[PDB]
Amino acid sequence: CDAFVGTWKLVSSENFDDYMKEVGVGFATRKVAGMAKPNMIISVNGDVITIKSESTFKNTEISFILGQEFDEVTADDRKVKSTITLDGGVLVHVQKWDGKSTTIKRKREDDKLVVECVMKGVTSTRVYERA
């Protein structure tokens, strides 16, 4: 994951409110979470990848090994079971909870890190730049 490592800042978002609605996030959390401009900090130590999200809304952190499921409390307080893999150079993060599923893909495109969040037919695209 060398080209993912570093400190990234959110610079654009599209369709995120609709993605959060599809996920089941309530009104007040959507409003405050949608305002956030997180920094995403990605690091690797051996086989362990750590992704931190720091913002005025919440500070979260996950550490994981590719292909190995882990339990995650999301920023909107879902208790999910997550599995992250590398598929053709894209980090693919699947979250399962309550019979539901959402997929978050992270990829390098030019000097950006593009984050695509999909729930059923709804996609949100979040673009990060190096900090």
Residues that constitute the known binding site for a fatty acid: 126-128
Torsion of CA 65, 126, 4, 73, to 10 degrees: -30
Contact characters 97-126, ligand QJD, x per CB under 6 A: -------x----------x-x--------x
Shortest separation between residue 2's beta carbon and ligand QJD, angstroms:
20
Cα gap 97→104, rounded to integer Å: 14
| Alpha-helical runs (H) found in the chain | 16-23, 27-35
Q: Using the rule CB under 6 A, which residue among 7, 15, 55, 123 binds ligand QJD?
A: 55
Structure tokens of 120?
Answer: 């059923």
**Per CB under 6 A, 38 contacts ligand QJD:** yes
- From the CB of 16, what's the least distance to ligand QJD, in Å? 8
- Tell me if 42 contacts ligand QJD by CB under 6 A: no
**How big is the site for ligand QJD, counted in residues (CB under 6 A)?**
18
Beta bridge partners of 67: none
From the list 8, 33, 82, 113, which residue makes contact with ligand QJD (rule: CB under 6 A)?
Answer: 33
Q: Taking a C-beta distance cutoff of 8 angstroms, is the pair 117, 127 a contact?
A: no
